[PDB]
Design a protein around this motif. Structure first.
Motif, PDB file in Angstrom:
ATOM      1  N   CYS A 168       0.829  -1.204   0.000  1.00 39.23           N
ATOM      2  CA  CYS A 168       0.000   0.000   0.000  1.00 39.23           C
ATOM      3  C   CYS A 168       0.863   1.254   0.000  1.00 39.23           C
ATOM      4  O   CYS A 168       1.939   1.303   0.599  1.00 39.23           O
ATOM      5  CB  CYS A 168      -0.859  -0.028   1.268  1.00 39.23           C
ATOM      6  SG  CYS A 168      -2.180   1.195   1.379  1.00 39.23           S
ATOM      7  N   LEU A 169       0.341   2.294  -0.646  1.00 36.42           N
ATOM      8  CA  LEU A 169       0.945   3.617  -0.663  1.00 36.42           C
ATOM      9  C   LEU A 169       0.027   4.576   0.077  1.00 36.42           C
ATOM     10  O   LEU A 169      -1.190   4.543  -0.122  1.00 36.42           O
ATOM     11  CB  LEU A 169       1.095   4.100  -2.115  1.00 36.42           C
ATOM     12  CG  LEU A 169       1.958   3.211  -2.999  1.00 36.42           C
ATOM     13  CD1 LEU A 169       1.761   3.534  -4.480  1.00 36.42           C
ATOM     14  CD2 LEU A 169       3.416   3.324  -2.611  1.00 36.42           C
ATOM     15  N   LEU A 170       0.578   5.436   0.916  1.00 37.68           N
ATOM     16  CA  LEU A 170      -0.216   6.443   1.605  1.00 37.68           C
ATOM     17  C   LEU A 170      -0.087   7.790   0.911  1.00 37.68           C
ATOM     18  O   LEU A 170       1.004   8.203   0.512  1.00 37.68           O
ATOM     19  CB  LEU A 170       0.190   6.572   3.077  1.00 37.68           C
ATOM     20  CG  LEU A 170       0.003   5.277   3.885  1.00 37.68           C
ATOM     21  CD1 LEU A 170       0.324   5.552   5.359  1.00 37.68           C
ATOM     22  CD2 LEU A 170      -1.356   4.685   3.727  1.00 37.68           C
ATOM     23  N   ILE A 171      -1.210   8.492   0.799  1.00 37.22           N
ATOM     24  CA  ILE A 171      -1.255   9.775   0.111  1.00 37.22           C
ATOM     25  C   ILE A 171      -0.853  10.861   1.095  1.00 37.22           C
ATOM     26  O   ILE A 171      -1.627  11.300   1.948  1.00 37.22           O
ATOM     27  CB  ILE A 171      -2.620  10.013  -0.534  1.00 37.22           C
ATOM     28  CG1 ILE A 171      -2.943   8.900  -1.549  1.00 37.22           C
ATOM     29  CG2 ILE A 171      -2.666  11.395  -1.182  1.00 37.22           C
ATOM     30  CD1 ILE A 171      -4.415   8.787  -1.887  1.00 37.22           C
ATOM     31  N   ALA A 172       0.400  11.286   0.986  1.00 38.12           N
ATOM     32  CA  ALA A 172       0.977  12.261   1.889  1.00 38.12           C
ATOM     33  C   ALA A 172       0.840  13.698   1.400  1.00 38.12           C
ATOM     34  O   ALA A 172       0.820  14.615   2.224  1.00 38.12           O
ATOM     35  CB  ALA A 172       2.449  11.936   2.123  1.00 38.12           C
ATOM     36  N   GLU A 173       0.789  13.888   0.076  1.00 39.07           N
ATOM     37  CA  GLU A 173       0.602  15.184  -0.575  1.00 39.07           C
ATOM     38  C   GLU A 173      -0.205  14.914  -1.838  1.00 39.07           C
ATOM     39  O   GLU A 173      -0.155  13.805  -2.386  1.00 39.07           O
ATOM     40  CB  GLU A 173       1.937  15.817  -0.989  1.00 39.07           C
ATOM     41  CG  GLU A 173       2.857  16.095   0.154  1.00 39.07           C
ATOM     42  CD  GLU A 173       4.212  16.649  -0.241  1.00 39.07           C
ATOM     43  OE1 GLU A 173       4.755  16.286  -1.304  1.00 39.07           O
ATOM     44  OE2 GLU A 173       4.764  17.425   0.552  1.00 39.07           O
ATOM     45  N   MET A 174      -0.925  15.934  -2.313  1.00 39.32           N
ATOM     46  CA  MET A 174      -1.629  15.858  -3.588  1.00 39.32           C
ATOM     47  C   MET A 174      -1.187  16.993  -4.498  1.00 39.32           C
ATOM     48  O   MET A 174      -0.752  18.043  -4.035  1.00 39.32           O
ATOM     49  CB  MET A 174      -3.155  15.908  -3.422  1.00 39.32           C
ATOM     50  CG  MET A 174      -3.694  14.676  -2.727  1.00 39.32           C
ATOM     51  SD  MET A 174      -5.464  14.485  -2.824  1.00 39.32           S
ATOM     52  CE  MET A 174      -5.671  14.117  -4.571  1.00 39.32           C
ATOM     53  N   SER A 175      -1.348  16.779  -5.799  1.00 41.59           N
ATOM     54  CA  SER A 175      -0.876  17.724  -6.795  1.00 41.59           C
ATOM     55  C   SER A 175      -1.870  18.835  -7.103  1.00 41.59           C
ATOM     56  O   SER A 175      -1.507  19.803  -7.783  1.00 41.59           O
ATOM     57  CB  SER A 175      -0.579  16.969  -8.092  1.00 41.59           C
ATOM     58  OG  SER A 175      -1.705  16.296  -8.586  1.00 41.59           O
ATOM     59  N   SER A 176      -3.103  18.712  -6.646  1.00 41.96           N
ATOM     60  CA  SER A 176      -4.190  19.557  -7.071  1.00 41.96           C
ATOM     61  C   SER A 176      -4.288  20.842  -6.257  1.00 41.96           C
ATOM     62  O   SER A 176      -3.872  20.929  -5.096  1.00 41.96           O
ATOM     63  CB  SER A 176      -5.470  18.740  -7.011  1.00 41.96           C
ATOM     64  OG  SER A 176      -5.532  17.977  -5.818  1.00 41.96           O
ATOM     65  N   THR A 177      -4.866  21.849  -6.897  1.00 45.81           N
ATOM     66  CA  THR A 177      -4.989  23.163  -6.296  1.00 45.81           C
ATOM     67  C   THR A 177      -5.895  23.124  -5.078  1.00 45.81           C
ATOM     68  O   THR A 177      -7.021  22.638  -5.143  1.00 45.81           O
ATOM     69  CB  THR A 177      -5.543  24.144  -7.330  1.00 45.81           C
ATOM     70  OG1 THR A 177      -4.638  24.179  -8.435  1.00 45.81           O
ATOM     71  CG2 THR A 177      -5.694  25.511  -6.753  1.00 45.81           C
ATOM     72  N   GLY A 178      -5.405  23.662  -3.968  1.00 47.32           N
ATOM     73  CA  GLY A 178      -6.145  23.670  -2.727  1.00 47.32           C
ATOM     74  C   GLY A 178      -5.984  22.422  -1.890  1.00 47.32           C
ATOM     75  O   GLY A 178      -6.647  22.298  -0.855  1.00 47.32           O
ATOM     76  N   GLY A 212       5.326   2.940   0.730  1.00 45.21           N
ATOM     77  CA  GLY A 212       5.712   4.265   0.309  1.00 45.21           C
ATOM     78  C   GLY A 212       4.525   5.193   0.232  1.00 45.21           C
ATOM     79  O   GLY A 212       3.500   4.976   0.876  1.00 45.21           O
ATOM     80  N   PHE A 213       4.714   6.221  -0.582  1.00 44.61           N
ATOM     81  CA  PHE A 213       3.855   7.386  -0.597  1.00 44.61           C
ATOM     82  C   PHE A 213       3.494   7.793  -2.003  1.00 44.61           C
ATOM     83  O   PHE A 213       4.285   7.645  -2.936  1.00 44.61           O
ATOM     84  CB  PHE A 213       4.560   8.602   0.039  1.00 44.61           C
ATOM     85  CG  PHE A 213       5.049   8.313   1.413  1.00 44.61           C
ATOM     86  CD1 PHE A 213       4.172   8.358   2.484  1.00 44.61           C
ATOM     87  CD2 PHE A 213       6.352   7.915   1.647  1.00 44.61           C
ATOM     88  CE1 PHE A 213       4.586   8.039   3.770  1.00 44.61           C
ATOM     89  CE2 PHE A 213       6.770   7.585   2.929  1.00 44.61           C
ATOM     90  CZ  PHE A 213       5.896   7.653   3.981  1.00 44.61           C
ATOM     91  N   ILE A 214       2.304   8.373  -2.112  1.00 50.18           N
ATOM     92  CA  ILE A 214       1.987   9.331  -3.164  1.00 50.18           C
ATOM     93  C   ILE A 214       2.316  10.699  -2.589  1.00 50.18           C
ATOM     94  O   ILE A 214       1.795  11.082  -1.532  1.00 50.18           O
ATOM     95  CB  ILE A 214       0.516   9.260  -3.586  1.00 50.18           C
ATOM     96  CG1 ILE A 214       0.118   7.863  -4.037  1.00 50.18           C
ATOM     97  CG2 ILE A 214       0.239  10.312  -4.647  1.00 50.18           C
ATOM     98  CD1 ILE A 214       0.868   7.292  -5.150  1.00 50.18           C
ATOM     99  N   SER A 215       3.207  11.431  -3.247  1.00 48.78           N
ATOM    100  CA  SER A 215       3.640  12.717  -2.731  1.00 48.78           C
ATOM    101  C   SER A 215       4.202  13.532  -3.887  1.00 48.78           C
ATOM    102  O   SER A 215       4.462  13.005  -4.963  1.00 48.78           O
ATOM    103  CB  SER A 215       4.686  12.541  -1.638  1.00 48.78           C
ATOM    104  OG  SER A 215       5.813  11.836  -2.111  1.00 48.78           O
ATOM    105  N   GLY A 216       4.433  14.813  -3.647  1.00 49.58           N
ATOM    106  CA  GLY A 216       5.045  15.657  -4.658  1.00 49.58           C
ATOM    107  C   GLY A 216       6.542  15.737  -4.566  1.00 49.58           C
ATOM    108  O   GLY A 216       7.203  16.243  -5.474  1.00 49.58           O
TER     109      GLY A 216
END
Ligand code: PRO
Ligand code: PRO
Ligand code: PRO
Ligand code: PRO
Ligand code: PRO
Ligand code: PRO
Lengths: 258, 258
Positions: A143-153, A177-181
């Motif tokens: 599994c990956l955890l969503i730590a940051e998102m790319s979208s506005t706001g 790992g992560f979904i992150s920027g």
């Protein structure tokens, strides 16, 4: 003391799914994840076959497939094994633990039966991970955890991002790992995957924002780029994938240095 | 200057879906939403038929139905029209705007074609709402934003909750209220729906935490209770639903006062 992908694949605390991924990234010289954002099974499979050699991972949204069947996913697995890439269902689990376990194992999609990787939002607290793990650990999934998102706001900033990192650390038997920027963890056993990537600047009209492969791999320290429309909307998706692969791979090599 | 549900249904800025809901709540003396957490279509439909008179809303997780078809949802709509309740798909949309529009309209579930209400997490920023609205506004649907969660370690607190309220205010043509543990908006046009509800104290082993109907409607100011296992695991689900309905309705009457 940054290690190559191949050396990271051998780290003591590496998760087996992460190790498999890192090894094939090194073997194939790719750190590109294709976001296979299509509504037709035939297009999904034709992209997976043609672009398979260029990618480390194929990311799905199976709930957008107009003609989903479990047999489609069997065919996708055949291609993933042939060309050596992992399958990542971008389901963004985000419910209480008792619910997400059922959404992962069951229903018509049976996600855990075919997805090497899934992802989750951390907003519910760590029960989201504990629920997924109940299904995923026995099935040897990650599994990956969503730590940051790319979208506005995006609200995945500051203490929220820190909470995601702590949650991953504390669930390292399942979280890979992560979904992150950008790089958010200093532990090299964790993968960083970054969406919101195109060669050209800009965004979409629904809050997506883009950065380049050189920026996100080279300057922001991420491992893998996730690319959708930058490839999918191009005429020649194979050449587009190769341009993104070469961009992400060189950025990685340059950061790694001597 | 709190208004009854029936008067709130007439407010100038009320959304038509909210108005329909508030009117049937007042007519039927129910502020209970059944969380129909089952894996079989027959059980879903049998619960909807028997409990329909007792509920203002039936909340689904269609991705947990082992035998989902669009025809099942047609049968559910027949029961919703007969017994007068709304259908709420608890999908927790939580992706970028361009993706959620496709997840709402398309794929095998075609959620927008049968769900009066859906919900969304606010973590991606307001593009999540803008994407859903593209599909939902033409289809005269409504959306709930997740401002707070009931589970242990929830990050939907503080400034996150405030951002959810602001996002709802600014998208009032489509957003009709909140998933929350309490009243979070002072604007009476918005519905507050609260999960994590049982008559008895406690929780589950995956982070769920419970509060009673009297606490969440009467002391915390919410409008509607969402009840899953407190009903579904009981032997007589009709009597259980009636106990929850009476609890939530009286708590509302007592708060409303003279
Ligand atoms: O933002 C910029 O200026 C450069 C142009 C290509 C992508 N990044
Ligand atoms: O910003 C835009 O609209 C185009 C499409 C993505 C990259 N540049
Ligand atoms: O040469 C080495 O050993 C390291 C790893 C590859 C690049 N620098
Ligand atoms: O928490 C308590 O003490 C009471 C008992 C029933 C539900 N609430
Ligand atoms: O806390 C428990 O385990 C039981 C079940 C929910 C209410 N009390
Ligand atoms: O009596 C009235 O007018 C208000 C509304 C119902 C209870 N108090």
């Amino acid at each position: 003391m940054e290690l190559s992908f191949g050396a990271r694949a051998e780290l003591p605390r590496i998760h087996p799914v992460a190790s498999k991924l890192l090894r094939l990234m090194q073997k194939k010289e790719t750190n590109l994840c294709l976001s296979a954002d299509v509504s037709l099974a035939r297009e999904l499979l034709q992209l997976a076959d043609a672009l398979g050699p260029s990618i480390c991972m194929l990311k799905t949204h199976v709930d957008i497939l107009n003609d989903f069947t479990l047999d489609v996913m069997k065919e996708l697995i055949t291609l993933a094994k042939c060309h050596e890439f992992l399958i990542f269902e971008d389901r963004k689990f985000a419910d209480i633990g008792n619910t997400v376990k059922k959404q992962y194992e069951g229903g018509i999609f049976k996600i855990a039966s075919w997805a090497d990787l899934v992802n989750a939002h951390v907003v519910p607290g760590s029960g989201v991970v504990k629920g997924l793990q109940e299904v995923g650990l026995p099935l040897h999934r990650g599994c990956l955890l969503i730590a940051e998102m790319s979208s506005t706001g995006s609200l995945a900033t500051g203490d929220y991002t820190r909470a995601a990192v702590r949650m991953a650390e504390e669930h390292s038997e399942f979280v890979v790992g992560f979904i992150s920027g950008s790089r958010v963890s200093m532990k090299p056993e964790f993968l960083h995957l970054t969406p919101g990537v195109q060669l050209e600047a800009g965004g979409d009209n629904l809050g997506q924002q883009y950065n380049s492969p050189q920026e996100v791999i080279g300057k922001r320290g991420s491992d893998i780029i996730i690319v959708g429309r930058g490839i999918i909307s191009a005429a020649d998706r194979l050449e587009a994938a190769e341009m993104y692969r070469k961009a992400a791979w060189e950025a990685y090599l340059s950061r790694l240095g001597v």
